[PDB]
A = this chain, B = another copy of it.
Amino acid sequence: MQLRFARLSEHATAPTRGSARAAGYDLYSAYDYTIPPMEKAVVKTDIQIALPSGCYGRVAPRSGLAAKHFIDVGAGVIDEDYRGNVGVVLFNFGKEKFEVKKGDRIAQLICERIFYPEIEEVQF
């Protein structure tokens, strides 16, 4: 169905797909970050999103950033009921120092289909 979103500021960019059948919607940064080596930043999208029923939005890493700059994505479980600013938890591993500019595609968002089951205790 529909991935509804709203901007929270002029700095936000609409999620965009890299190709017709890309799994993820790229998420852009709303600000500049300087993230030191072996550090973490919570990067802001300045968007709230409303995920379709029966899924959640998984923040996943891009492969170019992972493979080329040693960037990972922490956290990344966006719940169907979350109406706040979507944050991307980025990990800068390895040497150097990762530089994020406003408008940078730093992750991607996937509508992972899940169950919400009732839980029931019974008796590598």
A residues whose Cβ falls under 8 Å from a Cβ of B: 1-7, 14-16, 18-25, 38-40, 42, 50, 52, 55-56, 60-64, 66-68, 70-72, 74-81, 87, 89, 91, 93-95, 108, 110-124
Cβ of A84 to closest chain B Cβ, rounded Å: 9
Tell whether, in the assembled complex, residue B19 and residue A120 are in contact, meaning their CB atoms are under 8 Å apart.
Answer: no
Told that A42-B67, A63-B124 touch, could you supply 15 new A-B pairs with CB distance under 8 A?
A1-B118, A4-B120, A5-B122, A6-B121, A21-B79, A21-B80, A23-B79, A24-B77, A39-B94, A63-B87, A66-B89, A67-B89, A91-B93, A111-B116, A112-B112
With A115-B113, A120-B4 already in contact, the answer to whether A77 and B56 are too (CB < 8 A) is no
CB neighbours of A115 from chain B (8 A)? 1, 52, 55, 111, 113
- A114 and B112 alpha carbons, distance in the complex (Å): 5
- A38 and B37 alpha carbons, distance in the complex (Å): 11
